[PDB]
């Protein structure tokens, strides 16, 4: 079994930006745990567990067709100092990275390769789901406010 | 046994009645957790859940008197925005009960009736409660404002 | 993310439909059990909490895409006096919601929505086999004939 | 505190009736268990313990209110051969039973004793329950028949 | 919601009459401790925390109708030195309280307040039964006689 | 053993005093409970049922000296609307029991009775840890606000 | 509350007097560990933890009057090379603590401040339990000489 050079092509421009998220999501964790902000810490390294488990998922996938996993690229990684920041970086990596599926989605089934679709498919979906996370959580900070939002995932101990 | 058909209408009514209420308080509930604001929802849904145990108490005792429940109709049904306008909406939703409650109760114990009065008098003080749990909520919004009441309900986990 | 308005359309008319279902499914189980046919009456039961569960699962898609769910009409409702007669009013009710599953999924599938998509296509499997359960006890009905058919299903507890 | 006559009256009626209806529930289920119908037996008894137990509430308030209790009367007491028999008379008992509590309701509350009064409404909302159950099995036995409906209470024991 | 005062009154007074009997009661169980009566004493404590918690019920529901309880108020306390005498002091108390009890039933019923009625209905028949359990005692030492009755309440030590 | 009546009027007072403040606080932790503050409640019923307990030993030392206690007297109750006013009403009503308790110890240790002495003692330290609480609550909430402050004792339900 | 000065300086100097014997304990039990009299040294280290107990608990009472601890100042501090200049040492410590507490006491007393005087007797009993636990060590040692005395604490203990 060898797959078109477009379905490759596409699965490793997924994993270089799996790769990208992650290490953009765990450097933004760590930030936020150095400022006493623990619960958001919490939830920014569950989601780069996550990412590591699809970039894993990818690579399982490229390699089953006789190709060559990428794991020199990196896109750029953005950084933010305040909240508001750290959520707009990621809700642009979400829309980049969902854009990109629904595309892929489309060639590959196009060509009679289904277990790659059903891949994007799945990751479009949890993508889907941070995104909408990250957008309620941009909305709680608009309503509130910086320092009132704050107050309540600062715990001592 | 055939009760008598204004004891039946009263009881359609108050079905129909309930009926409205469950489908307002799940889609408020439904509303309020897609904001964020997590224990508000899940008292709306525990409210949403005793709606619906109202509501086949009422089909049952319809039922044991041959006569026939009505499922198909349905009341305005009110949503809001904000916080303040779902506590007013609910308020208004447990006033008309009430208000229809008593009128009722009043009618069926005049025609010896004693059971489906006895119903309706444990409804009435259900809706009695919850009537006093939304004015509170009202009153303590009204104190301490919009943003700092909200600021005691969100959570994010998991 | 803002949906296409002809795919809240969709989804807000099965919604409906789900909501209609769910209370000719309950009005039948308690019809069924004032006459004293339990084990019916526990099928019907079974069946209108999937339907709420279909129901919900529904209103949480609307609600990701930026929609307002209807909660406000509802289609005509059927009840029925003999055994027959509620069967084959499910059957009516299974065969709308099929067919307009299929359409649904089509046109979503058409505009590059698969969450949508998918979500019609575990309700379709749903339906039919419910629709396979109806048509087998109709057929069940019809070989046996109603009492001895009846006999069945009543206990004394 | 003495209650009215009145009172005394309508509740050494009552239990009167109650003491009617346990003798011919024990005599009815004691009949049909030497017919080998085994299911109909333990529903006939435990609704002649019930008929003890109101029995007994009956008593304690009579006792309450320095009054003698009557066990001395009984009313008459109907056999039947056939199980349609059976279920019409107790169908006749329960009516008779729930026109004196309605009337027995109303008089007590006209004279402010009013524990005697949810006495009777909770007695009143049993005996409404038991000739529900009567009523169904009637109709069961005139949709069904005599030889198929008792074919589902025989065991072999 | 705001109940007619007539029936914020009849409340009042049951509380007003509730805490006197809880005082009576108290002081009556450590009056018969003192003087080596244990089993009597018991009763006449879990009588009194029976009064507490008619009180509670009865502050609740004032509270609820949006009026002030009366926490200040209380009626003449009797204390008696033998034990026929705090019987027949118990049973003055109990008397007065169902007379109340059912004055307030019917005034209440007659204005559409269903709940309040239901309310003094229980507390109605708790304190039937306990008049019922004073009479019985009563009696009872009519019959024995106040050293061989007394002679069955006393206990050595433990 | 028969006490100076000094020693007996001291103990009468105190005891007065002690059924006022049981009136009070349940009242208090009551109205608390009605508007949403739930912390609060629950550390003002504790309060009370202390206070009972200090009314129960009360009795039990004026019962030994062969007295009768009074359970007819009542001084006024001071009911608040706002958090301050009942945090300001505990404050003067201990300050009152401590200045007792100092006059009632050095009189009754003048006349060699100790038991009673060292039974105002133990009131006396329990009073002044209530006070510093007290004082405590008025302090954060002079630094903090009344809105801020209500905002952390507030809590939904299941 | 504010009390006297006079008061909070006595509590202040029975402070400074319990760091001191803090210190000088824990440093002693150090010492007898480095030189293998290992239970010894276990029970020099209980005692420097009550005295511990005994600081916090002061430094509380201090708290609760509205003043200000001194934890700057230190009284002079002994140490000792053999076993019986330890002992004597300590012994100087309680003489003074003993002392200072009595005069302390009378003094608290003469004013009506109660629990004071309390805090003062409890550590004037533990004072005077462990001097004389001192002077049974020191006959001890004066009667069967210091090499049969250590030859009874030394452990190889792995
Ligand atoms: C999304 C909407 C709904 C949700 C989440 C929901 C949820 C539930 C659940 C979990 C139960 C108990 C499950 C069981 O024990 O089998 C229940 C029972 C019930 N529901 Fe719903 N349901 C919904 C819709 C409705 C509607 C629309 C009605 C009436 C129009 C209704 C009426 C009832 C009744 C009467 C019961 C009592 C069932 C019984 O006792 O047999 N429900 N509901
Ligand atoms: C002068 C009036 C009162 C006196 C002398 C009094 C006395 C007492 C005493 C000494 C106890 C002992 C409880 C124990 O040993 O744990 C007690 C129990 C109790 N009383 Fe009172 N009380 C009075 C008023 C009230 C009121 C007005 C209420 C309610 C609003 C109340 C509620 C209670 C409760 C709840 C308990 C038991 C607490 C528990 O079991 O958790 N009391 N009473
Ligand atoms: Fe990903
Ligand atoms: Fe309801
Ligand atoms: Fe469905
Ligand atoms: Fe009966
Ligand atoms: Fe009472
Ligand atoms: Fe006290
Ligand atoms: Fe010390
Ligand atoms: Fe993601
Ligand atoms: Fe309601
Ligand atoms: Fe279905
Ligand atoms: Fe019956
Ligand atoms: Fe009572
Ligand atoms: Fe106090």
């Given at each position: ?5 477009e ?42 567990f996550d ?6 998922v990818?690579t399982?996938?490229?390699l ?7 794991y ?6 953005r ?56 957008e ?11 320092s ?6 600062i715990?001592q101990?």
């Open positions: 079994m060898q797959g078109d050079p379905v490759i092509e596409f699965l490793n421009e997924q994993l270089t930006a799996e790769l990208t998220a992650i290490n953009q999501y765990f450097l933004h964790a760590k930030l936020q745990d150095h400022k006493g902000w623990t619960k958001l810490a919490k939830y920014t390294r569950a989601e780069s990412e590591m488990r699809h970039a894993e990818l399982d996938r490229i089953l067709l006789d190709g060559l996993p990428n020199q690229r990196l896109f750029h990684v950084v933010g100092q305040s909240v508001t920041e750290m959520f707009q970086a990621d809700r642009e990596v979400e829309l980049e990275a969902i854009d990109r599926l629904r595309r892929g989605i489309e060639v590959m089934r196009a060509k009679h390769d289904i277990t790659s679709a059903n891949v994007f498919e799945a990751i479009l979906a949890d993508e889907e789901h941070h995104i909408d996370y990250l309620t959580q941009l909305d709680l900070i608009e309503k509130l406010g910086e009132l939002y704050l107050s309540t995932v715990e101990t």
